[PDB]
Nucleic acid binder design. Structure first.
Lengths: 154, 109, 54, 142, 117, 101
RNA sequence: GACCGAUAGUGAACCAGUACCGUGAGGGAAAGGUGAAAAGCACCCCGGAAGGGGAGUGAAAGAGAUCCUGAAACCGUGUGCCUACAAGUAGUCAGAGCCCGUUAACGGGUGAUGGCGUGCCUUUUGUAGAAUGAACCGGCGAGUUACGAUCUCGUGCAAGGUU
RNA sequence: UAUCCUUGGGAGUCAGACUGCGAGUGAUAAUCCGUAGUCGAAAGGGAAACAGCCCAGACCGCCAGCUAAGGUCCCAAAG
RNA sequence: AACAGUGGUAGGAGAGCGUUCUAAGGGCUGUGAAGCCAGACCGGAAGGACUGGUGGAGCGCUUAGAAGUGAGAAUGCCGGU
């Protein structure tokens, strides 16, 4: 702003005897390299909602998928080896061609490391579910144990 | 048609135009004779440009002399040099040393 | 006195009406000279209608 | 969409004597004829009048004492220059000029008015040279 | 973010100069005087679009007056007779037919005279 | 040669010509009949006092459109008052086929 | 990085606290872009040279050294219509004649004649002013953020609400 | 005839001008108060030109008609 | 539909047009994008298309969100003439 630009501090010139405009500083906002009026300043954009609102939101986004049978629940997910080819074969076995969200109980390293590189697949635990993630991806695959744990939490 | 152009000759416009107004649309020999008889600064430059155009027409495109006429001729302005002259009571004044481009295009009548 | 207002292009162009040059006096080449001036010498050899001088 | 007029017209020739008639009561009618308001093809921006010849212009008449009181002034643009003439001198020395002034003052100003005025011919006496044009006599309707 | 603001002012200013085509001298090149003149011609047209309505009635009246005086009537008497000899609703524009076909106009004048006396 | 009244105005029509008038609210293709016939010319002359009795003029419609745009702009000096808008006045084109006196 | 993109961002994207100014403390700039590759124009002609016209390289030479793009102010060459009797905030409405032919539309350019018509902003009871301001063009340039107070609207819950 | 009250949210304005009508002044030679209008914030028509006088309140288009103040010999429409 | 209304400075209220960035979908470009130039096209305004030339590699549409958000005047600043 006006008081942080290097320089200034004195009248530019006396500017008297010929009748020029009464300049006060060479860093005024209207000069060529002067300060900036208002403009951006560091701050943080973040607020919070009541807890019941968050619970209702997550319930609604979960039920919306069930409304149009976009939720596929399977007995269990198990990969002996962390191979992306195996994960691609599993996805192709089902009718999953767009971005999909994998939900598993606790945390499985093999599945997380096998589906990591596929462009549209994201892996989260039952504790890490959220509205934006589930509302973004199209098809949600969830382990039955994860279903039970999510039911218990809410 | 044959063209000859001189770029940034140290001569101000509005002074070369006076001479160029005399030789526009006339025959080549008459134009050269006119240019040889007027005591002004731009005449030697314009004569050289005209003769260069004549030589280009004769050599490159295989045209004929004694049959050419000055179809096009004009003077444009170019880059300007700015200088300063001191004046009384500690003041300054600006001086513009101007430059011009000269173009001549001859053709068979 | 300083000008009260600027002058338009039309007035300037109309003022420059009489500011032009004149076509010189054209005569014969003296002693096969090059198209000399009236009452003067040939450009080639300073000739007076064939009467060379200087 | 009415019809204007453009160069496809004819101009007649009329002769009016000024014996006995007063100045204004004749000048008004003559000016109206000159502007061309007496024909149904009138047009503001085009000359549609006729040619008016006046004879016996020296026998004009004025009512009251105006003949010795109406004064014509003019200025020569020099300081102190203001020339005056009584109506009697104007009548007995320049009879045509008085009629011309009276009629001219009654015509619109501008280019068309001054071009309209060129159709008026005023003669002192009872003789005019306009014979090849075959003038037609015209009495003052008003 | 920062909006530099280019490419918008030129597009808007160029449209003003396009309506000023045909003006005398610098009024068709410089933006400020062009804008001043285009605004002034804005209400010069509104004023004249209503004067035009009352500038042709005058022409029609003058022509009808001349044509009627060619018959011995005047304009006022002819109009009163027409308004009274029945009505024959006839705008002055359509009674201008004295110029084209003079015979019918004489018939109308004859009817008006017949009722007027 | 007939003088008809339409659209709050009066026009003169002879068969074979085309005229532009105010909107007739008629779809392009059908036939309209004008009833207000004031004058009839040519050979015999008929002058109806309000109207000529038993006279109808026939025409057909082929186009309904709008005229060229007129931009209305007004302003007041020194008081900062501007106003701009546009206008395109509708019209209907018809050609006469029978005066039908 | 819902930060800037060469008048912005550090004063400084470039030999910058440099050039320059002042005895001294001190003040303090302007200036980016050939091409994928120098393949940066051998050779011929005019010219003292600079600069041009051919030939050649290259997709492009109208990319040839301040070299991507190249607006406005300003300066010129050619031409269709008008102009040497005319009084002018020069435009608008009506209108002959002449020249053209479009995003085909009750088309385009010019314009003799007729009517009307005292620029823009600011301020004042009131301005055509002889009250202020602008030579012209281009770029930059003025109601925001944080914390409190009160009111309207929306959503969740409800004698409870909420970290 | 359709305006009025209460509550709550935002304002701007703060000792204007002229012309008629009734009272008191300088010296009824620029003033004072009460009352009405217009301009301020209002274009159009008439007073030759003329914020305050007379008629009258502009959403836009039309080459349609009737009138107000004021007018009808020529400028300039109408006896 | 039928009635009624639509001059306006300081001000109060409402509905809209444009510019840069972010999120998803949908899709245009070397068979020529942004920018610049010309035109007799379209909406009630702010404005938006369509053809042709130049240009030589990036841009836009629909729905939301955030603002260094729109210039004719400050004897404004810088540059060019």
């Amino acid at each position: 702003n006006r008081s942080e630009v290097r320089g200034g501090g004195r009248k530019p010139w006396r500017q008297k005897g010929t009748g020029r405009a009464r300049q006060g500083s060479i860093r005024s906002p209207q000069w060529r390299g002067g300060g900036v009026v208002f403009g951006p300043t560091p701050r943080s954009y973040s607020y919070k909602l009541p807890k019941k609102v968050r619970r209702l939101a997550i319930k609604s986004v979960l039920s919306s998928k069930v409304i149009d049978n976009n939720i596929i629940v399977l007995e269990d997910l198990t990969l002996d080896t962390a191979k992306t080819k195996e994960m691609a074969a599993i996805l192709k076995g089902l009718s999953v061609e767009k971005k999909a969200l994998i939900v598993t109980a606790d945390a499985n390293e093999a599945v997380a490391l096998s589906a990591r590189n596929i462009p549209g697949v994201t892996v989260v635990e039952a504790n890490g579910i959220n509205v934006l993630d589930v509302v973004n991806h199209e098809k949600l695959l969830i382990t039955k144990a994860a279903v039970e744990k999510v039911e218990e939490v809410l | 048609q044959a063209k000859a152009v001189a770029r940034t000759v140290r001569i101000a416009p509005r002074k070369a135009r006076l001479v160029m107004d005399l030789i526009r649309g006339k025959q080549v020999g008459e134009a050269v004779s006119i240019l040889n008889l007027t005591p002004r600064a731009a005449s030697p430059i314009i004569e050289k440009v005209l003769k260069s155009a004549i030589a280009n027409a004769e050599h490159n495109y295989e045209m004929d002399a004694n049959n050419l006429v000055i179809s096009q001729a004009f003077v444009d302005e170019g880059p300007t040099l700015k200088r300063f002259r001191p004046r009384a009571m500690g003041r300054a004044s600006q001086i513009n040393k101007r430059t011009s481009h000269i173009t001549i295009v001859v053709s068979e009548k | 006195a300083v000008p009260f207002r600027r002058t338009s292009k039309m007035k300037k162009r109309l003022r420059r009406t009489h500011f032009k040059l004149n076509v010189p006096g054209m005569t014969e080449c003296p002693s096969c000279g090059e198209m000399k001036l009236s009452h003067r010498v040939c450009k080639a050899c300073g000739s007076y209608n064939g009467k060379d001088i200087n | 969409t009415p019809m204007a007029n453009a160069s496809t017209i004819e101009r007649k020739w009329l002769v009016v004597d000024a014996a006995g008639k007063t100045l204004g009561r004749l000048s008004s009618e003559v000016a109206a004829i000159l502007r061309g308001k007496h024909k149904p093809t009138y047009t503001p921006h085009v000359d549609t009048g006729d040619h008016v010849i006046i004879i016996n212009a020296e026998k004009i008449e004025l009512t009251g004492k105006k003949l010795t009181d109406k004064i014509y002034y003019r200025h020569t643009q020099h300081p102190g220059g203001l020339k005056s003439r009584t109506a009697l001198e104007m009548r007995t020395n320049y009879p045509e000029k008085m009629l011309e002034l009276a009629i001219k003052g009654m015509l619109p100003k501008g280019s068309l008015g001054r071009q309209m005025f060129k159709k008026l011919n005023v003669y002192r006496g009872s003789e005019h040279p306009h014979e090849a044009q075959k003038p037609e006599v015209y009495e003052l309707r008003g | 973010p920062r909006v530099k603001g280019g490419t918008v002012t030129r597009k808007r200013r160029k449209k003003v100069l396009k309506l000023a085509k045909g003006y005398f001298g610098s009024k068709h090149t410089l933006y400020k005087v062009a804008n001043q003149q285009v605004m002034k011609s804005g209400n010069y047209a509104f004023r004249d679009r209503r004067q035009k309505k009352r500038d042709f009635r005058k022409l029609w009246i003058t022509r009808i007056n001349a044509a009627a005086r060619m018959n011995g009537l005047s304009y006022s008497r002819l109009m009163h007779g027409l308004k009274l000899s029945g009505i024959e609703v006839n705008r002055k524009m359509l009674a201008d037919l004295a110029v084209n076909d003079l015979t019918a106009f004489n018939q109308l004048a004859d009817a008006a005279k017949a009722q007027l006396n | 040669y007939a003088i008809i009244k339409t659209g709050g105005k009066q026009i003169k029509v002879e068969e074979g010509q085309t005229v532009y008038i105010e909107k007739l609210a008629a779809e392009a293709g059908e036939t309209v009949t004008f009833e207000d016939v004031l004058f009839v010319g040519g050979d015999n002359v008929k002058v109806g006092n309000p109207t000529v009795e038993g006279a109808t003029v026939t025409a057909k419609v082929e186009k309904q459109g709008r005229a060229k745009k007129i931009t209305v702009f007004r302003y007041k000096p020194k008081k900062n008052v501007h106003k701009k808008q546009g206008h395109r006045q509708p019209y209907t084109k018809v050609t006469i086929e029978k005066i039908n006196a």
